Amino acid sequence: SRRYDSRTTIFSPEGRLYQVEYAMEAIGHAGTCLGILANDGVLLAAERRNIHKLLDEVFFSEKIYKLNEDMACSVAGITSDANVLTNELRLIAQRYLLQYQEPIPCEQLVTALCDIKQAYTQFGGKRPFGVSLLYIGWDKHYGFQLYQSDPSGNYGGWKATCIGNNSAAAVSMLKQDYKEGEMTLKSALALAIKVLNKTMDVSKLSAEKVEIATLTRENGKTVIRVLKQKEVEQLIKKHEEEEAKAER
Amino acid sequence: DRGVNTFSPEGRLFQVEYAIEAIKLGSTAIGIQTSEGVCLAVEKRITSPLMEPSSIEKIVEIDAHIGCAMSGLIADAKTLIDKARVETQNHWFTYNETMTVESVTQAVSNLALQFGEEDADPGAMSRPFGVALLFGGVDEKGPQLFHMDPSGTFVQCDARAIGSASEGAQSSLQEVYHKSMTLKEAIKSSLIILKQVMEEKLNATNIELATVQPGQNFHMFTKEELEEVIKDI
Amino acid sequence: SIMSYNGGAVMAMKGKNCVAIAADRRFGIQAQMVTTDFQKIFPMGDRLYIGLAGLATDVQTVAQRLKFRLNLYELKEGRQIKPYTLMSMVANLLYEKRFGPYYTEPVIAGLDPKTFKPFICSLDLIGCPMVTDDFVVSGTCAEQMYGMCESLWEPNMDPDHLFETISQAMLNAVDRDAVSGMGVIVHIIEKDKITTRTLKARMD
Amino acid sequence: SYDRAITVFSPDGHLFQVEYAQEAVKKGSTAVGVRGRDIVVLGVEKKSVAKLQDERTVRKICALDDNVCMAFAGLTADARIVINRARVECQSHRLTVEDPVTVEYITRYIASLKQRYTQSNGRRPFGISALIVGFDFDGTPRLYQTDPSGTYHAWKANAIGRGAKSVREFLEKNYTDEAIETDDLTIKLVIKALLEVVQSGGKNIELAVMRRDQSLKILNPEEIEKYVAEIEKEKEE
Amino acid sequence: GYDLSASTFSPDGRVFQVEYAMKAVENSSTAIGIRCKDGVVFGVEKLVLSKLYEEGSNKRLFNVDRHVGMAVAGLLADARSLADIAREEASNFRSNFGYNIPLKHLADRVAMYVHAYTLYSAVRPFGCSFMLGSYSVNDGAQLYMIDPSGVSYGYWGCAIGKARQAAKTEIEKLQMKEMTCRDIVKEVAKIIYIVHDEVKDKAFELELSWVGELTNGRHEIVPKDIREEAEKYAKESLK
Amino acid sequence: NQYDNDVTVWSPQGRIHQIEYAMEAVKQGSATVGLKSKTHAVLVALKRAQSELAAHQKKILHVDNHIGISIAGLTADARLLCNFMRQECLDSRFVFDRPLPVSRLVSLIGSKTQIPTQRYGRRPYGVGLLIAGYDDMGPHIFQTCPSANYFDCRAMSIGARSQSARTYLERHMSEFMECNLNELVKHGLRALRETLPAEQDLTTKNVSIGIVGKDLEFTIYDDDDVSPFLEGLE
Amino acid sequence: RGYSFSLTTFSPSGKLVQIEYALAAVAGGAPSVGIKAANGVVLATEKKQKSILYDERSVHKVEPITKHIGLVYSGMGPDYRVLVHRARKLAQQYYLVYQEPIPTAQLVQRVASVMQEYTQSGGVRPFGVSLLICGWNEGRPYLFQSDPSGAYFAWKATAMGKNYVNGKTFLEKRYNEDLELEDAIHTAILTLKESFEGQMTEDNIEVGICNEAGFRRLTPTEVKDYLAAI
Amino acid sequence: MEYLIGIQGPDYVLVASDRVAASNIVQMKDDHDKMFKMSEKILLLCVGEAGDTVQFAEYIQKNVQLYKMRNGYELSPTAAANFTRRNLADCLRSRTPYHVNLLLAGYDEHEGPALYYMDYLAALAKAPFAAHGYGAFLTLSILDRYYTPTISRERAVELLRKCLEELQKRFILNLPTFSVRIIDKNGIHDLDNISF
Ligand SMILES: [Cl-]
Ligand SMILES: [Cl-]
Ligand SMILES: [Cl-]
Ligand SMILES: [Cl-]
Ligand SMILES: [Cl-]
Ligand SMILES: [Cl-]
Ligand SMILES: [Cl-]
Ligand SMILES: [Cl-]
Ligand SMILES: [Cl-]
Ligand SMILES: [Cl-]
Ligand SMILES: [Cl-]
Ligand SMILES: [Cl-]
Ligand SMILES: [Cl-]
Ligand SMILES: [Cl-]
Ligand SMILES: [Cl-]
Ligand SMILES: [Mg+2]
Ligand SMILES: [Mg+2]
Ligand SMILES: [Mg+2]
């Protein structure tokens, strides 16, 4: 019925896709989520939105998802949409493993999902998924990697980036502090806390309010860990000590 | 916004009428039927010297005895042309005989109104074809020229023009055409008419011409054969 | 008989706080040995292994398809799969092919990932499960295997005695079967380690 | 399934979805192709720079097969779909004909895919144009362009994306037997064409070449800025 | 606006598209049925829109089974499609259950089919009302009428189309329970002549059919001689 | 207005505008006439020619040995319907080895053409037909409309300025049943000629004729073959 | 046929307004409360129960999904009966494969996924309900909420429906982690008393509990007993 | 009837195959090639039923080449072996089974040389050497007798020759010529045919 169809998969007069844009506005308001590549690993750090006192704490994270042995992701935007997509990512990764008997290379996993997102902008008359993702991983072709994908079905690789609230500000701070070819996990962790300290300008930064996951290699095996609150507090403490030095 | 199969108060399908307006955005093509064969001639309409002229193909062979000139939205013509080709080969396969020009034209014309959004397969045609076609060939009725437009109406014509300058070209055709006219005369006549109607100066790279004769198979004129005919014109 | 085309044998056995699982190593096609290091026992967890005998192609398919399902299971759930739950997962996979089955009859051996309690089971080719408190066997020399396990197995065996019993049960059983053998591999699964051995064995 | 007619005619014979697709292509990064004597070259703008970007992951020049590559301008997600469809088709062709595709064959395939997405229910047109290059079995070099409508032509040289009109104008004056007499001058003709439109010249021209039988070579920033200087110091004289 | 789809209620709880379909039936010329002692008789005022048409063109009286007649008003192409649905239903009933479909069941089944076209944007309501008539020794005389909403009731007398009310008021004067079909055809012809507006629509054919003891439970056209007499009676009664 | 774009939308007057618009396609086609005697059914049609050098559009189509049609409206719809008719006829000869009675074929047309008038996103057929046939009940002329209604006719005319042709046919219809064939076709031509501007005449280029009857299979007369029938409009 | 286009779409500010309007149907529903005690869970709800004419026992808002899992909701009752039916079916599909009762969190994930579908799939609106799902497994109690978007959350205690904002601050100033189930039931009913209006009887509230022994509704007589103190 | 053999050394894999295409009592081709290049460093050797063999091997070949085009790098000999296996196994119980027996030979940058054996049932085994066809029955024990893991490529070609001479002597079929190729770090190399 033509009267009620909002026509979600058509061009506007400038060659634009309005839903896609509109989905990108949803993302910009969601929890800030950054990724940082280092020489010995990759990390994700995310603002938590689940922070009311009466919440119960039952999973090992709020917005960090393990995809397969060698890969994880974080998300900004519509949570239920993110659940459908991360489920689909796990399925694609297992289909590839079944067929080839090796892990899916990171970029291939991202591309496979982005093609699904792409389809939702071109046919079927449905709303797109209101999700942007950051993907971290290791494979044998390009080692440690970080990708970003959005509701247009576009992706790229990054050394450091941010999606969600205050993204532009977070990327400026990264442009200025990030040392191409010279970062370590320990210095990326410092930078991530620096960045979240500034971009959560409402208000004072706490371990209850962020989530950090690291992805490293140990004895020929990928290790993916969500940092415990003791460690997050310790990094916050070190960042606060470090800013005391800032003048003299 | 209304559905694609909506009739106007005059009893026409809006989509078909609009498709008919798209034909006017095409280059001019001419067909003439003589007792010695048919010719088809088309303005190429070159938009840059960097474009390769031979990659503009607006006259195509359907089979050895039938050619086709198109005007309008050229990309739309491809499925029509392919259908004509498949059909003539099916007919050869099944009946061991060549298919008449009229029959080819009929078969293609039966695709015309097959569009719509809630009878058909998961992604069937959404709109009519923005193309007009002149089928020129020779069969056992003799030489023959047929015209078809996006309504699926088709008819035999002794001479016809289609595209941007078709009014114009059609008037000159009524003036010059006669039943006993030779094919060489028809060729000259249609190049004279293209020359009038074309925005650019006519030459041997910005037009195409083809013939079909009782003697001889579909033949596209070469650069050199065009130059020869261009001398007098 | 389809099940004897490749031959082969697996078994598993329970001891005190430990389990053992073992397999012959031959990949052959009717009379012809093709290889002598063919894998039939696959990790499904740190302390959980599945052994498959039967048609080699289905041994590989079932292991691979099972792994697909288990990995999705573990990602989705909080956690490592329980032995009994693996059994049910395999049962369900085999019974989906009830009318065109995979020709394999697995055994499972492991320790509960939280309680470390020993578990062993086997299933027929259409997914009927059987848990036992002693041993299970599957392959072209099942009768031979039964005779050895019924005579030698005892309750509450420590890791060393379990290893000797499963090893002697396997070696002597496959030595009465033309199309099983060409080596034996044994995994002993304890709380704090896995011990993997290949046995001195007949090669004819 | 969703069967709405999306591309329909309007009064006067316009197909608005297709026109809007063409607007998408015009906001894409500039891409240029020149057909040499025994080389073909593709160059493309930018797109944004950004030091924190992994360069490898956003190229706009792509192999379709060993003897055919393409650049595009427009919606990059749409392009990826077209590219992959074409790559599948190149393998069917080799499968059933045991020859590599001609450049015209695969162009014609892409074009007809694009046309079908302007006349099928439930779908919008692809918002990309493509420049497709390579060599036919007999060694003849080729450059083709497709647009969202499904129309396609062969070109001696061409540009698509933002600033195509002025890049085309430049090429029209500058494409001569002399400008493509050698490989190096062909390559330089592409760079000169871009350096006209390209913001912080340049820096951010990606460039690739295809030689008869020799398969796709992409140039690196060190090899590009050799050509840049070699043209800049010649334009002082 | 609230009146474009049968899947949209208005704020007062109406389905205007069904009401509009009802207006097409009310624009049509009048059909009547009367049940009597030994059967059911139908009459239709059949407007002749051109002298070029044959006698009998555009019948509005149909046989839907050997024992069941149908009389229609409204859009004639919709009515004919409904006559096909009724036929198919009677045929299927005989195949599945092995005996002639009871009138009431047929009426209820075709009414549910009419009803199904009043729920959805995908389709439109039928622009027709129709009467079904039968007779058997076991069930006696039965006359049902179905409208575009799918409502179905039984009647002693019924009229549909544009002079519906005038027709009913004449039908009410008859003691039809005690009359035979042979008596009632005359009265049907009489009533059609009364409600016919001879100023506004110039020419009409009377169409008559019946089913009763006298036809052995078969629905049949009234024979020509009997129709002509009934017309002559109706005309002279108009005087 | 809000009521005229969907065949599924009734107006508040109990009309369906899309169906009425489809009927306009027939009123703007070129006129055709059909009439019958006791023994023959005849169709006569004016063919419109696009330009002076065009053939003239076919108006009369063969359906089966005992059935032919004349068309007015969308030519593509006319062919689709004609192809349906042809198939229904072949089917009945295949199944029963006898011709499909003309009144049953017409019923099938009414039932087929009604369906898209009631489903969203479909449209009526934009064509009207005159149908000439001969079977056990003698000759017939039927008319079909985009509304899916159909009519059994002593004679009929549809298309542009057909009112004139209809008047002529009413004026002389009492003569038709007793006419020999030549007389009957003459009558068809005179009716058709009423539809023309005063200047213009019936010629061998613009008239097409179809005839079927007891001893004659459906036959089409065009071009030089119409001249016998046109000479002696005297 | 079925409409194949989404009836929920993004607004120019990035909002899915149908989902926000579904949430407004939830906010206008009758109050529900869930409290996770140390040794169990209580779910409690108000009946929007007019009339003495209602047979209060004839339909329940607090429903078993499995022996160990139960649900309550705020919002539209008939929408809720759909989700109860699908949750039951999902729990049984899991049990057939794995031969173990579905973990509470796995049941919530699958139900929440169904609610997500109704925000994108063709020709349908979202569900106008929020679910509170209680369960016991791995030796431990669980309380989850699942909202019309398909988002879900684990709570120690919460309130939904009319006056939920105040309900949550009432619970914030009253819940402790070491609290027992018998006390929790008490505080759950006090939370409903905050926004009641009517005088509470055992016939116009419903209470369900979940512990190691399983999930069940409290009987009218048991509720009456807890209402004596209140 | 068709013979395939492979021998893997420390840093190469040598493979060979007969060059006959037979039908009923006649050789119809004496220069037949049973090897399919999948990638720069992968050969698939395929025998079995007519039609199935080419249709299967070319389908694998196109998909492996597609994988290269989509991803810019090549599938490892092990991945390609498991891809091949997945396809054969997935077809086994379908309406379109493929009756083919294979070897897959390759060289990986990091793993080194590999040789895989597959039967029509889609059982996959990695092996230091292997062979298919009736000729395997007469040559595998020659390989068992003389193969060592460090065997040099010159001695592998000698070992291969012993196998092929044994067919000339002892096998009832006339297989007079064999294709020989080797794969290593630098790709696929054609050796001279071994002929009698
Ligand atoms: Cl994994
Ligand atoms: Cl993996
Ligand atoms: Cl035109
Ligand atoms: Cl599976
Ligand atoms: Cl397609
Ligand atoms: Cl452009
Ligand atoms: Cl009425
Ligand atoms: Cl017409
Ligand atoms: Cl038309
Ligand atoms: Cl009508
Ligand atoms: Cl008319
Ligand atoms: Cl829809
Ligand atoms: Cl239920
Ligand atoms: Cl359960
Ligand atoms: Cl209960
Ligand atoms: Mg043995
Ligand atoms: Mg032996
Ligand atoms: Mg076969």
Side-chain angles (χ1 to χ4, degrees), chain C residues 174-182 204:
Chain C
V174 303
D175 294 358
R176 288 278 175 176
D177 177 11
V179 297
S180 297
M182 308 293 291
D204 57 345

PDB file of all heavy atoms in Angstrom, chain C residues 174-182 204, ligand 16:
ATOM      1  N   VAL C 174      42.381 -53.988  18.920  1.00  0.00           N
ATOM      2  CA  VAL C 174      42.626 -53.717  17.509  1.00  0.00           C
ATOM      3  C   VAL C 174      43.538 -54.706  16.801  1.00  0.00           C
ATOM      4  O   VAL C 174      43.517 -54.853  15.539  1.00  0.00           O
ATOM      5  CB  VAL C 174      43.145 -52.284  17.231  1.00  0.00           C
ATOM      6  CG1 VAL C 174      42.168 -51.218  17.774  1.00  0.00           C
ATOM      7  CG2 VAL C 174      44.543 -52.052  17.722  1.00  0.00           C
ATOM      8  N   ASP C 175      44.363 -55.373  17.627  1.00  0.00           N
ATOM      9  CA  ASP C 175      45.195 -56.507  17.123  1.00  0.00           C
ATOM     10  C   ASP C 175      44.366 -57.709  16.761  1.00  0.00           C
ATOM     11  O   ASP C 175      44.901 -58.598  16.107  1.00  0.00           O
ATOM     12  CB  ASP C 175      46.401 -56.821  18.081  1.00  0.00           C
ATOM     13  CG  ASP C 175      47.430 -55.631  18.125  1.00  0.00           C
ATOM     14  OD1 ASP C 175      47.177 -54.604  17.367  1.00  0.00           O
ATOM     15  OD2 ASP C 175      48.376 -55.656  18.962  1.00  0.00           O
ATOM     16  N   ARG C 176      43.066 -57.758  17.097  1.00  0.00           N
ATOM     17  CA  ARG C 176      42.208 -58.759  16.483  1.00  0.00           C
ATOM     18  C   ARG C 176      41.304 -58.245  15.393  1.00  0.00           C
ATOM     19  O   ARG C 176      40.365 -58.946  14.970  1.00  0.00           O
ATOM     20  CB  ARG C 176      41.448 -59.569  17.528  1.00  0.00           C
ATOM     21  CG  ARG C 176      42.355 -60.541  18.279  1.00  0.00           C
ATOM     22  CD  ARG C 176      42.573 -61.831  17.465  1.00  0.00           C
ATOM     23  NE  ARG C 176      43.514 -62.698  18.119  1.00  0.00           N
ATOM     24  CZ  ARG C 176      43.840 -63.912  17.702  1.00  0.00           C
ATOM     25  NH1 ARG C 176      43.311 -64.421  16.594  1.00  0.00           N
ATOM     26  NH2 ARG C 176      44.726 -64.641  18.430  1.00  0.00           N
ATOM     27  N   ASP C 177      41.621 -57.086  14.838  1.00  0.00           N
ATOM     28  CA  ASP C 177      40.792 -56.488  13.792  1.00  0.00           C
ATOM     29  C   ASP C 177      41.642 -56.023  12.621  1.00  0.00           C
ATOM     30  O   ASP C 177      42.492 -55.191  12.766  1.00  0.00           O
ATOM     31  CB  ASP C 177      40.026 -55.319  14.386  1.00  0.00           C
ATOM     32  CG  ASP C 177      39.158 -54.560  13.337  1.00  0.00           C
ATOM     33  OD1 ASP C 177      38.999 -55.051  12.242  1.00  0.00           O
ATOM     34  OD2 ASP C 177      38.608 -53.472  13.622  1.00  0.00           O
ATOM     35  N   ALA C 178      41.371 -56.559  11.443  1.00  0.00           N
ATOM     36  CA  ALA C 178      42.211 -56.274  10.292  1.00  0.00           C
ATOM     37  C   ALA C 178      42.269 -54.813   9.908  1.00  0.00           C
ATOM     38  O   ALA C 178      43.354 -54.353   9.516  1.00  0.00           O
ATOM     39  CB  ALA C 178      41.778 -57.072   9.100  1.00  0.00           C
ATOM     40  N   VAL C 179      41.112 -54.130   9.993  1.00  0.00           N
ATOM     41  CA  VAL C 179      40.942 -52.751   9.520  1.00  0.00           C
ATOM     42  C   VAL C 179      40.960 -51.638  10.603  1.00  0.00           C
ATOM     43  O   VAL C 179      40.590 -50.480  10.331  1.00  0.00           O
ATOM     44  CB  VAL C 179      39.683 -52.631   8.661  1.00  0.00           C
ATOM     45  CG1 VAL C 179      39.792 -53.496   7.400  1.00  0.00           C
ATOM     46  CG2 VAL C 179      38.421 -53.047   9.427  1.00  0.00           C
ATOM     47  N   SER C 180      41.458 -51.955  11.782  1.00  0.00           N
ATOM     48  CA  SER C 180      41.774 -50.979  12.773  1.00  0.00           C
ATOM     49  C   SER C 180      43.231 -51.157  13.233  1.00  0.00           C
ATOM     50  O   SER C 180      43.754 -52.221  13.232  1.00  0.00           O
ATOM     51  CB  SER C 180      40.925 -51.166  13.998  1.00  0.00           C
ATOM     52  OG  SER C 180      39.602 -50.958  13.652  1.00  0.00           O
ATOM     53  N   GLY C 181      43.828 -50.046  13.635  1.00  0.00           N
ATOM     54  CA  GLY C 181      45.152 -50.050  14.237  1.00  0.00           C
ATOM     55  C   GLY C 181      46.058 -49.078  13.543  1.00  0.00           C
ATOM     56  O   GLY C 181      45.722 -47.870  13.430  1.00  0.00           O
ATOM     57  N   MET C 182      47.216 -49.572  13.162  1.00  0.00           N
ATOM     58  CA  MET C 182      48.319 -48.790  12.674  1.00  0.00           C
ATOM     59  C   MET C 182      48.654 -47.682  13.629  1.00  0.00           C
ATOM     60  O   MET C 182      49.020 -46.630  13.215  1.00  0.00           O
ATOM     61  CB  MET C 182      48.043 -48.217  11.275  1.00  0.00           C
ATOM     62  CG  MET C 182      47.594 -49.260  10.253  1.00  0.00           C
ATOM     63  SD  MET C 182      48.881 -50.426   9.850  1.00  0.00           S
ATOM     64  CE  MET C 182      50.028 -49.425   8.961  1.00  0.00           C
ATOM     65  N   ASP C 204      50.751 -53.708  11.270  1.00  0.00           N
ATOM     66  CA  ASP C 204      50.238 -54.614  10.191  1.00  0.00           C
ATOM     67  C   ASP C 204      48.677 -54.815  10.190  1.00  0.00           C
ATOM     68  O   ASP C 204      48.062 -55.498   9.277  1.00  0.00           O
ATOM     69  CB  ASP C 204      50.911 -55.978  10.252  1.00  0.00           C
ATOM     70  CG  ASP C 204      50.749 -56.707  11.598  1.00  0.00           C
ATOM     71  OD1 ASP C 204      50.375 -56.089  12.570  1.00  0.00           O
ATOM     72  OD2 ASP C 204      51.083 -57.949  11.721  1.00  0.00           O
TER      73      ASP C 204
HETATM   74 MG    MG I  16      44.360 -54.338  13.586  1.00  0.00          MG
END
